[PDB]
Amino acid sequence: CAAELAALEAELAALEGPWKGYPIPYGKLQFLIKKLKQLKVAC
Amino acid sequence: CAAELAALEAELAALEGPWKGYPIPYGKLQFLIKKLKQLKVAC
Amino acid sequence: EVVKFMDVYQRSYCHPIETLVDIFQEYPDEIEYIFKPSCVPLMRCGGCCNDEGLECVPTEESNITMQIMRIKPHQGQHIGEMSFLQHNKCECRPK
Amino acid sequence: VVKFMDVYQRSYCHPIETLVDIFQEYPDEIEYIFKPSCVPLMRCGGCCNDEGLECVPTEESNITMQIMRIKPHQGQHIGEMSFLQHNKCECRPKK
């Protein structure tokens, strides 16, 4: 939970990379949804 | 922690709407960034 | 702050991107109506193949249905379903 | 089906990721071949739903990218290039 939470935090914070103001590809949203679901099942 | 995570999974799942394969604005993820900070020392 | 070469190359390369497409480009034989909105957001192949002999073409397609307002002289606005072609996968192919 | 108000709002004049050929931005650098040949930029797009209006920027910024540049004689160089971004857009009268 804690480390998976910290991981998702750091991924969301960094999510733009250098692409400031750019939309987040659907694939990345699905990856986040999967990570958040795996984080719910963890915890 | 698992209850908060359920809420956020639902909210994240809510962003796509009918827009399958479409990117999302990074602004639409702010709710999640704020909420995962609120789960660190909390959850 | 500088976008590294590797990142520019990955994000520019031929792939489906949200594209604002004029409905008349999809329904060129519509004579009766004008549309609101006039354009729709569609996923369509775009970006570059970095070879003037290559082009970015769809290899997988699907449809999306949207409610569009259809406006005609001397009558009320209608709202009706219209279907549009989506690109799901793209490849750089010889012209 | 995408509901009318969802289509209308997503189509309306706003910054969209737009794949722009570098020669459009650097028309005076056509002695070079750029790789990639296009870059993804945020640029006003979508529709104003009024032939009298055009979608124009009201807030702008710059982004710097590493781009490979080739004189057909010498070797590949990788150099920074700056591009104008659009951060906010409005439908404004053409005239």
The answer to whether residue B42 sits within a structural domain is: no
d(Cα A21, Cα D17) in Å, to the nearest integer?
9
Distance CA D16, CA D39 (A): 13
Alpha-carbon span B40 to A1, nearest angstrom: 10
Contact status of D57 with chain A (Cβ, < 8 Å): no
Before C37, cis peptide (omega within 30)?
yes
**Closest by alpha carbon to B5, among B27, B36, B26, B40?**
B36
For residue B6 the two structure tokens come to 């359920």
The strand order across the sheet containing C78-94 reads: C34-36, C54-71, C78-94
Strands D33-35 and D53-70: antiparallel
Bridge partners (DSSP) listed for residue C41: C20
Q: How many domains does chain A have?
A: 1
* Helical spans, DSSP H, in chain D: 4-11, 22-25
Q: Which of D95, D63, D69 is nearest to D82 (CA)?
A: D63
- Taking Cα atoms as reference points, which of B42, B12, B3, B30 lies closest to residue A40? B3
Distance CA C48, CA D18 (A): 12
Which residue segment(s) compose the domain that C34 sits in? 1-95
Sign of the C-alpha dihedral computed for residues C48, D70, A16 and A27 taken in this order: positive
What residues contact D47, with CB distance under 8 A and at least 6 apart? C20, C22, C37, C38, C39, D11, D12, D13, D55
Eight-class DSSP state of B1 = -
Which two tokens mark C2? 């500088």
Give me the residue label for tokens 């991107």. Answer: C17
DSSP structure class, residue D29: G
Q: Which technique? A: X-ray
Reference D49, options D9, D3, D89; nearest CA is D9
Chain D CB contacts of B18 below 8 Å? 1-3, 6
Tokens 């070879």 correspond to C51
What domain range is A19 assigned to?
Answer: 2-41
Distance from CA of B19 to the nearest CA of C (A): 9
* Whole-number Å distance between alpha carbons of C61 and C83: 13
Q: Does B27 touch chain D (CB under 8 A)?
A: no
Contact of A11 with chain B, judged by CB distance below 8 Å, is answered with no
Amino acid, res. C48: C
Residue type, D76: Q
Full DSSP string of chain C: -PBPHHHHHHHHBSEEEEEEEEHHHH-TT--S-EEESSEEEEEEEESB-SSTTEEEEEEEEEEEEEEEEEE-TTS--EEEEEEEEEEEEEEEEE-
Q: Exposed, middle or buried, D9 (CB in 10 Å: 0-12/13-18/19+)?
A: exposed
Give CA–CA dist C26/B43, Å, rounded. 51
Number of residue pairs across C and D with CB atoms under 8 Å?
Answer: 93
Please state the domain count of chain D. Answer: 1
CATH number at residue D44: 2.10.90.10
Answer whether B36's CB lies under 8 Å from B1's CB: no
Name the packing angle between helices B2-15 and A26-41 (round to 10°).
160
